[PDB]
Amino acid sequence: GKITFYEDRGFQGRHYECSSDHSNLQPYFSRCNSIRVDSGCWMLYEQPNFQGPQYFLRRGDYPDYQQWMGLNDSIRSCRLIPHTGSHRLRIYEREDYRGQMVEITEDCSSLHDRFHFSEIHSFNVLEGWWVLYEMTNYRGRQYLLRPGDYRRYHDWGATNARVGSLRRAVDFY
């Protein structure tokens, strides 16, 4: 895919164009106050090695870092999310895959009041990359889910259990 980083808002200052995964970006730029994404869906992290706060971005021009809900201006690592073919995920009521469960194939902007059960504690990502938000309507802390098991909340990198919405990481352009 193609992404460009700008140290200063309005697409100015020092810039660094990246075309794939990058475990560390601090040697290239020290602050990101603007970004242009020409293609692909990316996940950005506040720290190196893909740690700390995550942010999903797609095609579009961002003159200001609030355009992607940035907590601040640090972006020290990035991941290019591959092209998925079909999305399939199961949402469980209790931890370790217990209680009732549902299998969704599309976006849910409200998790606690959409299904036959309100509590949500584990996920098994059967197919495709998904983005998890702590709030409804895709707000709050974001967490990338790649195909695999997410038995307990820590597995998805959160420090708490708040989830509010789930959306398939797909391009919308």
Add this chain to the structure above:
Amino acid sequence: GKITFYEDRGFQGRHYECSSDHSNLQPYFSRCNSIRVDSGCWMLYEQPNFQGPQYFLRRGDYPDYQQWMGLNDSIRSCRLIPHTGSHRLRIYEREDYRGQMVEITEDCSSLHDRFHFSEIHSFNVLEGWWVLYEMTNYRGRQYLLRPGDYRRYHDWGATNARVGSLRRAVDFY
């Protein structure tokens, strides 16, 4: 369990008490216009060999055959439903287990407007005996589901795909 059949309403006429499965009842009584169930959950059929219309009955006294939603007064076979330990069933959106799906553990009086999807075409009974109705709030044609696969509607004995509610076959007394 214990069930008694009465040819005439109000608990009168010729009576036949049954304590288990019975492939044929026509040699004992020719019409059932009343029934007393002292214990256990039973499924009754209009014809011998457990075929035709089915009816779920439990503890209670029935002076008239409308008390169990009888289409008429024929009862030619019966089955005693065993004691289940936990109920677990999956409901699929499309036939042969396709589309989204949900796993329920309790009674649903409204199937088409309870989950994230409205269409319902197959069931996999993971545990326990369940009763399926064609209408909402446990009305219409009844179909017994024992643990197993129900990929297409014919598998549950219906001549059409109308389903409206599902309830666990358990004693409520």
